[PDB]
């Protein structure tokens, strides 16, 4: 087409979606990861994760307001990935990399799994 | 912090949100602009428009599934701006620029109003 494009638009949208999450505005699901609860927007979760895409496109599960994750999932790993979904920034550290990679494999976040594998390979 | 950042993440999220809109997945509002209806996600509308931010943060209006816009609003102008919200690309043409600018002023989309004013100034 003959369109013009605003370079910063996608980043500005994501920043605003994170501000809505912070202020608990229009969050429509609670993700339970053992004893912890995380509020989020179903659409952002689906846009970032192959697992959430499959869950919320399912005719029965799309209507649930609470989703319980597998008990093997580490809440800190999930928290780091949820922050990544809303900000593009991944808080990857020697002390959390294995939990983050395991959580990203479960959530089906291929780009995160890729960077974790590379950082692990560099340590070996 | 000591974060790493995935450059393409925000653009990839927006592309996926537009794919959900296309497939009518988890759209939760209908915007009525005279005889036309547009389905969208409340969170994306709020992230892009000062008008929708004010509407969906209001305790009564946040619960509405249908929003009727002012009858002076042109449906084509709205359609062009809705596509911009979901893609960062603005289909600005000599034949639609006045309707687009008027709609962006009403929706409170300051960056769109700015580019329309500049293209109009260049024509004069």
């Amino acid at each position: 087409d003959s369109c013009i494009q605003f370079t910063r638009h996608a980043s500005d949208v994501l920043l605003n979606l994170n501000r809505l999450r912070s202020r608990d505005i229009l969050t429509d699901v609670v993700i339970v990861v053992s004893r912890e609860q995380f509020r989020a927007h179903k659409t952002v979760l689906m846009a970032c994760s192959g697992l959430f895409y499959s869950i919320f496109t399912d005719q029965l599960k799309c209507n649930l307001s609470v989703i319980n994750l597998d008990p093997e999932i580490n809440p800190e790993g999930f928290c780091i990935l949820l922050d990544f979904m809303y900000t593009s920034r991944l808080n990857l550290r020697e002390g959390n990399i294995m939990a983050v990679m395991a959580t990203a494999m479960y959530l089906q976040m291929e780009h995160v799994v890729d960077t974790c594998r590379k950082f692990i390979k560099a340590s070996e | 912090d000591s974060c790493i950042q995935f450059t393409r993440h925000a653009s990839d999220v927006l592309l996926n949100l537009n794919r959900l809109r296309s497939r009518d997945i988890l759209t939760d509002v209908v915007i009525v602009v005279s005889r036309e209806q547009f389905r969208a996600h409340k969170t994306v509308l709020m992230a892009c428009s000062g008008l929708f931010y004010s509407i969906f943060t209001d305790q009564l209006k946040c619960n509405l599934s249908v929003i009727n816009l002012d009858p002076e609003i042109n449906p084509e102008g709205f359609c062009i701006l809705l596509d911009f919200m979901y893609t960062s690309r603005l289909n600005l043409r000599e034949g639609n620029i006045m309707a687009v600018m008027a709609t962006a002023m009403y929706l409170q989309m300051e960056h769109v109003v700015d580019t329309c004013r500049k293209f109009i100034k260049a024509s004069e």
Partner: peptide, 4 residues
């Protein structure tokens, strides 16, 4: 704004 840019030409994409």
């Amino acid at each position: 704004w840019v030409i994409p």
